[PDB]
Design a protein around this ligand. Structure first.
Ligand code: 1VG
Ligand code: ZN
Lengths: 47, 161
C-alpha cells in the first residue's frame, strides 16, 4: 500500500468532467474502514 | 469472530440502506461494460456485520485521526465492491484489498455511487463477469457490495476526469 499524501489521511477524487458522477475516496490504512453492511443483490434489466 | 445479522425489510435500517443503494445508481461512461446495464437493483438481503475486534480496531484508529484533525473524524458511509468481500468481513480491510493500479495510488477505494462499486464486484474492469455465465451484465447471479463506515480525516482533494 502507498502512503497518504503527507499531512492527510485520505484522498478525495472529485470528478471534474462527468457532472453526474459523485466522489470516490482512497484510504491507505485498512483500519480506517469498517464493513458495516453486506448487501446481496441483482442488477435489474431495464424495461 | 464475525457474525452476520439479517435485517428485516420492515426495519427502518434496512430501508435507509436500500435507499442509499438505489438512489446512487448512475450511468457510466463505459456504457455498462464493467458493471452491466441497469437503472436499479433487486435487493435480496441486507446483513449487519458484527465483529468486536474489527470494530475496536476501527474506533481506535478513528480516535487517532480525530485528534489529528480538530476532533473531526470526517466519517462517511461509502460503498465497496470486491471479489474479496468474504475475506474483508472476516478479517477486515488490509493491503491485500488495495487497488494497486488505481488513479490515486495503491490504496483501498470507496465510492458514493453504488453503481461505481458495482463495477468491481467481479474484479477490475468487471473481470470476466459472473463465475457461472462469464457475463458482466448478468441479471441472474447474486452480487454483493459492502456499505462501509470510512474515516477520511483530512482528505487530499484531487480534481480529476
Ligand atoms: O468499490 C470499489 C472497489 C474497488 C476495487 C479495486 C480493485 C480491487 C481489486 N484488486 N484486485 N482485484 N480486485 C477490488 C476492489 O475499486 C474501486 C475504485 C473506485 C471506486 C470504488 C471502488
Ligand atoms: Zn451469471
Amino acid at each position: 500500500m502507498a502512503h497518504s499524501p503527507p499531512g492527510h489521511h485520505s484522498v478525495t477524487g472529485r470528478p471534474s468532467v462527468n457532472g453526474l458522477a459523485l466522489a470516490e475516496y482512497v484510504i491507505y490504512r485498512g483500519e480506517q474502514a469498517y464493513p458495516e453492511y453486506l448487501i446481496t443483490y441483482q442488477i435489474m434489466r431495464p424495461e | 469472530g464475525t457474525i452476520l445479522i439479517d435485517l428485516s425489510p420492515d426495519d427502518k435500517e434496512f430501508q435507509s440502506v436500500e435507499e442509499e443503494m438505489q438512489s446512487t445508481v448512475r450511468e457510466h461512461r463505459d456504457g455498462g461494460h464493467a458493471g452491466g446495464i441497469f437503472n436499479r437493483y433487486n435487493i435480496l438481503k441486507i446483513q449487519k456485520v458484527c465483529n468486536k475486534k474489527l470494530w475496536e480496531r476501527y474506533t481506535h484508529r478513528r480516535k487517532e485521526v480525530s485528534e489529528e484533525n480538530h476532533n473531526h473524524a470526517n466519517e462517511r458511509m461509502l460503498f465497496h465492491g470486491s471479489p474479496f468481500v468474504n475475506a474483508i468481513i472476516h478479517k477486515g480491510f488490509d493491503e491485500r484489498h488495495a487497488y494497486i493500479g488505481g488513479m490515486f495510488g495503491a490504496g483501498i477505494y470507496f465510492a458514493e455511487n453504488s453503481s461505481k462499486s458495482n463495477q468491481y464486484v467481479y474484479g477490475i474492469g468487471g473481470g470476466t463477469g459472473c463465475p457461472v455465465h462469464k457475463d458482466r451484465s448478468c441479471y441472474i447471479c447474486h452480487r454483493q457490495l459492502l456499505f462501509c463506515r470510512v474515516t477520511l480525516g483530512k482528505s487530499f482533494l484531487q480534481f480529476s476526469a
